[PDB]
Write a protein that binds this ligand. Sequence first.
Ligand SMILES: *[C@@]([C])([C][O])[C@](*)(=O)[C]([C]C1=[C][C]=[C][C]=[C]1)[N]C(=O)[C]([C]C1=[C][N]C2=C1[C]=[C][C]=[C]2)[N]C(=O)[C]([C])[N]C(=O)C1=C([C])C2=C([C]1)[C]=[C][C]=[C]2
Ligand SMILES: [Mg+2]
Ligand SMILES: [Mg+2]
Lengths: 231, 235, 233, 240, 222, 195, 244, 211
Amino acid sequence: NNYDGDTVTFSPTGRLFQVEYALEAIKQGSVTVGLRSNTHAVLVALKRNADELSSYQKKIIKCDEHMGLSLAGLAPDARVLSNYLRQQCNYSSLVFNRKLAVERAGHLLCDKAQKNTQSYGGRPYGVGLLIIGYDKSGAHLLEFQPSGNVTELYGTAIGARSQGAKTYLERTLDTFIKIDGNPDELIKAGVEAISQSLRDESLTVDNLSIAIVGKDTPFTIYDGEAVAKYI
Amino acid sequence: DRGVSTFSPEGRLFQVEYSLEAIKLGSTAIGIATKEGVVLGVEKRATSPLLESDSIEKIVEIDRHIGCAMSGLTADARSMIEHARTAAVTHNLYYDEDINVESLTQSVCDLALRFGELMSRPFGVALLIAGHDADDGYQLFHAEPSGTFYRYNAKAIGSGSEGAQAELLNEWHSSLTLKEAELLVLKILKQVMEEKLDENNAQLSCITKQDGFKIYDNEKTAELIKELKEKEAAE
Amino acid sequence: TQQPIVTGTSVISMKYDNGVIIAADNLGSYGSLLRFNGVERLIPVGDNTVVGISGDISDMQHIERLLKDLVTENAYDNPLADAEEALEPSYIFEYLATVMYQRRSKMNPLWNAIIVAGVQSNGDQFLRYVNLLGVTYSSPTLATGFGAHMANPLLRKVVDRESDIPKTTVQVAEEAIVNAMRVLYYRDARSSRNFSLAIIDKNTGLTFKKNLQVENMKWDFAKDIKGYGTQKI
Amino acid sequence: GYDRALSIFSPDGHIFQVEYALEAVKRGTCAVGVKGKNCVVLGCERRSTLKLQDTRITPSKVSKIDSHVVLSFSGLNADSRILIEKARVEAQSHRLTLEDPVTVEYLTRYVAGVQQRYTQSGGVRPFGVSTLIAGFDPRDDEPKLYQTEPSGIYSSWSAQTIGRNSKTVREFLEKNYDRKEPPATVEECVKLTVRSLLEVVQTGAKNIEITVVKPDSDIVALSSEEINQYVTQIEQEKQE
Amino acid sequence: QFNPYGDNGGTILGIAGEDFAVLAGDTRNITDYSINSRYEPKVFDCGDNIVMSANGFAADGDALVKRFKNSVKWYHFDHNDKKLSINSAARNIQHLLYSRRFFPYYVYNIIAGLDEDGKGAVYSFDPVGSYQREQCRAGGAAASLIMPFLDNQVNFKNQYEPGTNGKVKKPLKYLSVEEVIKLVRDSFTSATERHIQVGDGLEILIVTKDGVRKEFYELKRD
Amino acid sequence: MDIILGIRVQDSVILASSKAVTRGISVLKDSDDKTRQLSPHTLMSFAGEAGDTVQFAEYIQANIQLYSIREDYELSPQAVSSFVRQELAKSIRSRRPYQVNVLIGGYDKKKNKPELYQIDYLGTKVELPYGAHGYSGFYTFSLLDHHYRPDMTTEEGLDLLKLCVQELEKRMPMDFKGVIVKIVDKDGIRQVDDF
Amino acid sequence: GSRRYDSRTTIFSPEGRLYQVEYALESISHAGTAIGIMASDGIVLAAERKVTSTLLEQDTSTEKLYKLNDKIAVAVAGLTADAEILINTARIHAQNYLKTYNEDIPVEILVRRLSDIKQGYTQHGGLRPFGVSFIYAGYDDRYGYQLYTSNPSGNYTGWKAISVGANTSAAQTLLQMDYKDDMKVDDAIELALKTLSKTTDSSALTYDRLEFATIRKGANDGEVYQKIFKPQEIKDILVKTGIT
Amino acid sequence: TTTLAFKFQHGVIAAVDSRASAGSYISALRMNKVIEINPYLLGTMSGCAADCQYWERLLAKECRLYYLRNGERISVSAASKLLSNMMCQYRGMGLSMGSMICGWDKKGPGLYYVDEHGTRLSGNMFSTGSGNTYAYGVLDSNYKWDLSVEDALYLGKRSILAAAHRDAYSGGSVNLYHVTEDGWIYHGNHDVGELFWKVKEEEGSFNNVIG
Ligand SMILES: *[C@@]([C])([C][O])[C@](*)(=O)[C]([C]C1=[C][C]=[C][C]=[C]1)[N]C(=O)[C]([C]C1=[C][N]C2=C1[C]=[C][C]=[C]2)[N]C(=O)[C]([C])[N]C(=O)C1=C([C])C2=C([C]1)[C]=[C][C]=[C]2
Ligand SMILES: [Mg+2]
Ligand SMILES: [Mg+2]
């Protein structure tokens, strides 16, 4: 109200409204689902178009051979944060000959977002990210919020109507975690999960975007007729 | 007052949303992509008859394989065009090749959100970036001040955009020729323009793989206008 | 640009079937003066890596601190710091190699020659060299300074190529290293009798031996040598 | 440094500071530009509220940017000096790096770019100035006349006016100026420029300034008596 | 005074075929009169069917290769996983080298691959960035020993057709991969004999449309 | 470059400058004009290190032309010479000084007098009836000391200048490929096309 | 943050005016009147000190008339402290010009420079403008005797006769009436004092409430002399012209 | 190296050799020392190969940007000046670059010499490199404005040959260019070994050499 003019102002109840408004941009964004087993990690994203003449906005971005994310909210902010991850993943490789741990990647994103929430002049990031990766401690899935909060999860979903997919994964927890050494079945579970967030529209060939990473599987994105198999 | 980079309660940047309103006041610009080429056309909209209309430059060359049309606060486009031309030629310097249309568009869109309290406000102009490369062929992009860019088969921006876009919805198909696209841009421009369309107050351009980016002469456009009138009178 | 003041001499090392061995004497020389006699130039990093350093001691102490700080920093927000995400020899080496090449590129080098010896997660042997120029190389045997000229020839008789590594036991490799250290004591004017030796094995882990001495030395034949040519008495 | 964003968008998509800069131009004295077949003439109003003025030393309204290009303006006088100085520096900078004098179109594009920069830079306000830039390109006999404004847009004009009561003199020019046959001589071009100012000026004494620019760096400013003869001839024909 | 440069010896060799290319180099690393390693790889697969070797001062050579590999990675990110053509890589490397015009990468660089028409390509550089496409090039310590042999045996220089007596040249028939590898092995065997910095081992990288293949051959260890 | 001469007579200033330009052991050009018009009644000739000469002259030219446009007024030769001196005095203590020597010949329209200023690369200014730079003065000053009068005509000034060039052509080891002569008077600057 | 407290000194009103410049001019209209009159053989500067005291040391006091160099002087109307900042800058600029070209600075060039500094404070920096209006009286060999005025907007104009400060409307009308082109310095002196005597808000115009100066070619042969009048000399010229 | 270029009635001829050296070692037999900046602009190269390639390709970037901004080809005079200004920034930093900027613009054919000192000279004829003295000898005695395209191409070709023969650091092959108002025209690569024997027989020159 009087305490939402900038990010440097707490409300009387200890809330940061600009951060909460940035969080609101994620809820307006298109749905994206993340889930993993012990061997593989999968991203599934519902892409959004402007109209029938327009293309479908890309949702998934590759950060390294072993790591990448999906976005929901302001796409340009995802480009900035993914570019930062690309640089950090790359700094780890060039200096330490070491693949960046997914957990450490989350800590770096948290700290980068935090600086924008405590200083005058700037603004919080208006995007949420689901980071998947496979490192020395196996498969991983992270959820990033522009408040700075990063959370390691078995599965999750963000964006509009994401609660439906999140409930499904909460039921299926014991099943999809055990899908080891079977990428197609893990993707099926992700496609079935994101389907719980759909209304009116359904999953078409240029609508669906899938990504996967695993033990002997580099981070690869599937679009177009490559995802027709899963429709 | 209030921050320039402030979020609204709905989760939108106030300034970005306000710049979009400025673009709605701008003159109409239309782009149509085909397999034979991409056509770009604009409404010049001279404020007075004494204004020499040929000096109105709302269609612009970025590279030999990339063209650009603009709508909104057209003065803001000059630094964006300068950056685009620099990015296009710089990539040719570093990699001895033409730059991808998407990559060029992305470079322009990276400037968009570089504002705060960097420039003091977002750009008040939208761009239709049309071009061709070997990888993805003939392409048409719509670059906004939000930093977002959508690829389009056909797109209209400016004051008569939603009316023109609805018309492009029906008319566009994947087997359009270049000549058909030219007449289609002229048809829709004539529909949304206030003043009567002629070769002096409207401009055409195209990008083909062979000849590259070309702005059409007033004599060449005049014939296409005359060809349009006759085919509409034919039924 | 500088000049080295207090210096450490050769560091020698070799691979064997189940790991690596590295050794270096405990002397800190001040030109021709054998000034400091209790200097440790082998520095363990965790329980899987030993960094052996020759050259300027002040720069060595600086590197010793960078490594100590590297371990501290790796443990930050890392539940697997003593397991999967512990420091590997390859990580430690590349860090040092990055630092060395950067410093030479600023014309302000760390006046050292470094050998990083260790065993990786998968049990693979690691042995790589880096120096003040940022030059890097790997070989079944590695040695700095005088060791390059005198020790490598002896150690290469045991492991002449990659295929000789599985055939070489820890007893044979240690014996070869200890003999090489004796030869260096005979012939290097900036060496000492006292030295340290470290073994990193993929089964038995890190064994760090201190206060070793060169023994079984041959001097008796000196009594018979008289004059410089014609003298008989 | 002072970084405050003064020029910003409003809910309806307007930049008020740029629009208020146009109001400063509306307040400024009237300036007019007319290009003939082989010349361009720049007319300027001088408000007669200020008498006891020393016309020798008072800053003239028309300014030479180079030997072949001139610049007149309407709006804040102090603001105009900054643009003129920058333009003059760029004109010499162009000759120094490219070995050709600036084209009229290039100089206009530069001045317009400066004006635009001051509409999206922090801590600065827009120039309260619109300019008329006229001249002839090197080794070219085609007349050039351009206009700029605070927003940074520019365009070429057969004839144009800016400043207070510019709406009236533009109305006059739109009906009197024929594109198919422009003022063939210098006399006809000046006569039309004086006629257009006489719609607004008040008295035709020291209130009208005329500057004729011809090809090949031939620039001259008319005197009071020379202009007064045009004023006399116009009204004598009008009495009929 | 501190000398930031050094000489790690070695020699490299690139030959372009009709539909293939080879980049070879010895595996010996040296300082002065000592051997550092008998097997220290010098030729690298950089991705996109491109192979590269930077010979001279190993520290600068490793840095350049490391930077170019990085340049390839960022080319994929920035340009939608587009394949970096050999001509585009060459131009990119020129700019990497000239960035240090006043503190040079002390290396002679060679890259090899296929052009956009599928034909074999070799590009050659000097330490400061001048490059050009070539059919045949030897670089490094024994470059002056090997190049004349290649002028003679690859481009048939000073060779004429018998009976004509210098009136008609030997026609420029293309070479097969098997014939090229023979010239490479003989080139390095000859260089190993007469150059003290060359020996120990030979590693050859062959580039075809099918990918990058390796071949290793031992050399004299003296 | 090599030789630049200057002489101030009754009603004009005459500047003579060599035409040769040499790189390595080859004379690349034998028609080079080592001068720039700073203003309608002010001419500057120059000589010094390769490249620096033209860059400096053009930089000065741009600054004086900028002044002329700003004030709609021609600076006096004295004012221009002082501006040039300051730039050279500023330059000599820079990281890399501009190694340029100049003569400035101008006609002062206010005083109705010709004026010749000699300035070296250190910023050493002197007003003179006749002047030169480098070794040129060693050969020519004895002739000028003998023959010069202040009431000389332009034609007599040219004849005395011919004698100076003839002496240079006889006793200098270097071939400077003749001179381009320019006259600065009340009517402006003109070139003597036959010399 | 800090934005909350920013007055925004460099912005346009909806009518296209600069708020702070207009308010600075309002400040200046309450300042003591200063008058400049240019004649064929010299220039007069006359100015009124504001409500003085008997205990003010007049002979060592200077609030209105300042010397920029030997050829140029200024009369001040507004904040004296603000004027001294600008005056010291102008003094430096004149010396920079003299060092560069070895000639005294032309009057207009000095005026343009100061006016450009004032302009800058209205367009950028976020600072308040200088609440000062100058009358420049000077001489050079190009245009001869010259009068200029500058104000907080940074706009300057040339004049034959001009007033700044309080009652300029009334003062300008009186000057416009009695001024003629063939006028001389002694006549201009009389006109300046007569105009102040009629426009003044004080009961009577006395020597202790005035600062006076002339720039004359009335110096021995072709040269210019600045004369800052002393208290006793102002008293004498007041008697001579018949005011006291 | 040896390079030359000269103006004549039918445009401008540009001829260069193709050798490269690293001490006494001939490092390259066939190097392109001409850059095709645009269809109406050429640039010759002499000095440090790296400097020549980098800066002349950077010139082509800047000349291309000129066309985009102005909708018109850059003049030869302006192009040569941009290059000379680049040289002035790295003044005394150790660059080595001698070049001729050849082309056709509105003033007709244009030829400018530019070097690392920032020197910029207009003229009808230039020659740079270690063998320029040998080329000048042939050019000066045979050059006319009234030359035919065929005779002019031969003159530039024969002039490089003269230098290639005598100068140890010049040779390999000859690259010919002819600049017209419709643009430059490449007139091929000519091996000096073969060209020498051909010219010797047909012309009767090089009598001292046995063949
Ligand atoms: C004459 C052949 C020799 O003076 C001519 O000037 C050429 C000009 C040239 C221009 C473009 C391309 C090639 C050549 N110059 C050289 O050959 C220069 C001469 C030179 C060496 N050092 C030096 C020179 C000039 C001025 C200062 C210092 N030679 C080179 O630049 C040498 C270093 N280049 C090479 O040897 C190699 C080149 C080029 C090259 C090599 C080696 C390998 C692969 C591709 C290119
Ligand atoms: Mg040996
Ligand atoms: Mg001197």
